[PDB]
Amino acid sequence: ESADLRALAKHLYDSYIKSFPLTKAKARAILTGKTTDKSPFVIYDMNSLMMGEDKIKEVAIRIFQGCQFRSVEAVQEITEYAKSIPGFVNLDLNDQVTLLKYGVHEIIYTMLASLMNKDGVLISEGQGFMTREFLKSLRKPFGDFMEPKFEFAVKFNALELDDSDLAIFIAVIILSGDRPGLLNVKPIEDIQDNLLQALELQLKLNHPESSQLFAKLLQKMTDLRQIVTEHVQLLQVIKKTETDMSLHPLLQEIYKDLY
């Protein structure tokens, strides 16, 4: 049993490396300045935003549109990673779509934390760094969009997960049997139960001194759902007070009848 759970963990890590160009290991090196690559361009005010718009009409709207296109790319990367989880492509296609529709924003926020520190977030494949204070400086309601993600990220990053832990954590979230409208829950729960046993063993071996880390990650799964619920609400305000504000077609499809 345990040897097979390590082979599953390794498969997921290898698939995560294939699916996600900017890993946590690569992001932390950039953020702490321990890489040979050119330093990211720092965006901390409007003048620096203008200067760096090329290395990466109203400003808050332009930032929100770039957020959308990055989110679309992330949905596609997350979908390829999901298709690498053993058993996932043999699920009913309706259920694959439902798991991704309800799971991809929880995964986006998990993986965004890998690009964040308390002072800002890496953007454009690590070629830019936007400060948390600058995001706070945007006019309402856009100035509150990112702050809940930074708050989540600071506490999540304190758990010191690596990419090998994250690969299994993300798979567990995708294979959630309680999403609304799933047609065949038992095969999903069977895959998830095996992923949960792999995650427990991964954290016992990789974080032997981190007591109750598994329970803490289960609770982060709950927290991520609440984050996403709150995010969906903020978006419902954008469409009732902001014009020139239409979501990309892939995001429209995901958000339609979402929560």
Binding site: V75, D95, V97, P249, L250, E253
Partner: peptide, 15 residues
């Protein structure tokens, strides 16, 4: 299928 019909783009990416 009803979900499939409402998610043309996610279906294309999954396929």
């Amino acid at each position: 299928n009803s979900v499939x019909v409402r998610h043309x783009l996610l279906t294309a990416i999954l396929x």
